[PDB]
């Protein structure tokens, strides 16, 4: 059975056909045997409805790098609900079987994450924010906000994590650069304009329940959990004497556009810890409610003004 023996014999079998193909190539293309044989085999694959193998062959005849950048791997790992362990399992399996790296390792994704997370882009407020630091590299600030946890002080039995409000807004605005650019381009507006954009944000806070407590060492935390999030709703610019709606969320009730701000483990009716945790956020909000943000996206420094609205409250 041919296509199963070794060499020096399958040749001896196909010698006549090989010399005929050589004569045909010399008569047609003067001896371009490689290209004509490649074309013949491609059409032979296409005849039997095997487009996959033929496409793989015509792609490898270039010999090219079919490697995914770490951004695509991160998007796949996030938007498909994959834990890091299962992703690593899939990564090692594909690499060991296919003998190459279609996907990127974990450290590349970790390094790429540091761009989307807050505390990575520079910015500054032209009116300085009262009682708010101007540093622009803070990440996950502790939720307790330096609350006194001594034995004489009022007892503390809650844990919390959260970002800086202004840094979160900067990161959210920098995430939607392409959308704002496309909105300005579509509404017959020059992209290099840097007018005083106006941003409206919807806030929300709810108290969850039935969250199981864990074992181990630490403070005796309760079971009721509370979160606090926001959402960029609409943006306008003052062009002439109008307000062009450059961007509006098409699904204002989807979980894909509700960006988190703060987490905690406390009762909603516990008025003491609730205020002790939410005081810095309200402070930053009231502070930045009388200023304007400037930052450079697309190579042009812009201008922003916020008008917040709190409606996601039962």
């Amino acid at each position: 059975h041919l296509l199963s023996l070794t060499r020096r014999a399958q040749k001896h079998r196909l010698r006549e056909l090989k010399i005929q193909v050589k004569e045909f190539a010399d008569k047609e293309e003067g001896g371009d045997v490689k290209a004509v044989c490649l074309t013949l085999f491609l059409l032979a694959l296409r005849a039997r409805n095997e487009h996959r193998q033929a496409d793989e062959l015509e792609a490898i005849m270039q010999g090219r790098g079919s490697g995914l950048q770490p951004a695509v791997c991160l998007a796949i790992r996030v938007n498909t609900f994959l834990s890091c362990s299962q992703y690593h399992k899939m990564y090692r399996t594909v690499k060991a079987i296919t003998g190459r790296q279609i996907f990127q390792p974990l450290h590349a994704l970790r390094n790429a994450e540091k761009v989307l997370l807050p505390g990575y882009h520079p910015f500054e407020w032209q009116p300085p924010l009262k009682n708010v630091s101007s540093r622009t590299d803070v990440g996950i600030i502790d939720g307790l906000s330096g609350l006194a946890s001594s034995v004489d002080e009022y007892p503390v039995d809650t844990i919390a994590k959260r970002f800086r409000y202004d840094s979160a807004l900067v990161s959210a605005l920098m995430d939607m650069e392409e959308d704002i650019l496309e909105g300005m381009r579509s509404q017959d507006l020059d992209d290099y304009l840097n007018g005083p954009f106006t941003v409206v944000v919807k806030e929300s806070c709810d108290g969850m329940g039935d969250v199981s407590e864990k074992h181990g060492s630490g403070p005796a935390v309760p079971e009721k959990a509370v979160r606090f999030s926001f959402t960029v709703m609409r943006i306008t610019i003052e062009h002439g004497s109008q307000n062009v709606k450059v961007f509006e969320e098409p699904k204002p009730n989807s979980e894909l556009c509700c960006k988190p701000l703060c987490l905690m483990l406390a009762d909603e009716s516990d008025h003491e810890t609730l205020t002790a945790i939410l005081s810095p956020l309200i402070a930053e909000r009231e502070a930045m409610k009388s200023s304007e943000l400037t930052l450079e996206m697309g190579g042009i420094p812009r201008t922003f003004k916020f008008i917040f609205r709190g409606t996601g409250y039962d």
């Binding site: 090219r64 790098g65 490697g67 003998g99 190459r100």
Partner: protein, 133 residues
């Protein structure tokens, strides 16, 4: 570790010796020899098949990587610039130095020269252009 001859082979070897001794200056063509043994095999073979077979028991006693991707890869280093700038010097001064010993020499030269700006700052600028492009 290689192959061996056969009965048929150690008479073609005698013919090879013959047509290489008749004129040991024109061993260029094989087609003539291809039409030479056609008559030599058409007697005087047992004494040669013996030494041919004599080698029967004698001879019986003896990664996937990348495929040419784009080339924003591996910007050169300070030591690489030092090599690229000082290997041809020692090469023209001493051609017999294979780059094993020549590279050991260039390295022990670099291992004696104290550290900088033409190498390290240039490498940093190259890496900066590397991360962007």
């Amino acid at each position: 570790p290689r192959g061996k001859m056969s009965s048929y082979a150690f008479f073609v070897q005698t013919c090879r010796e013959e047509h290489k001794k008749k004129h040991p200056d024109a061993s260029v063509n094989f087609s003539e020899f291809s039409k030479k043994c056609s008559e030599r095999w058409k007697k005087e073979k047992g004494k040669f098949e013996d030494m041919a077979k004599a080698d029967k028991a004698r001879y019986e006693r003896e990664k996937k990587k990348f495929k040419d991707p784009n080339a924003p890869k591996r910007p050169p280093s300070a030591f690489f610039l030092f090599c690229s700038e000082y290997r041809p010097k020692i090469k023209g001064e001493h051609p017999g130095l294979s780059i094993g010993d020549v590279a050991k020499k260039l390295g022990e030269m670099w291992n004696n020269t104290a550290a900088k700006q033409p190498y390290e700052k240039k490498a940093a600028k190259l890496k900066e252009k590397y991360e962007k492009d």
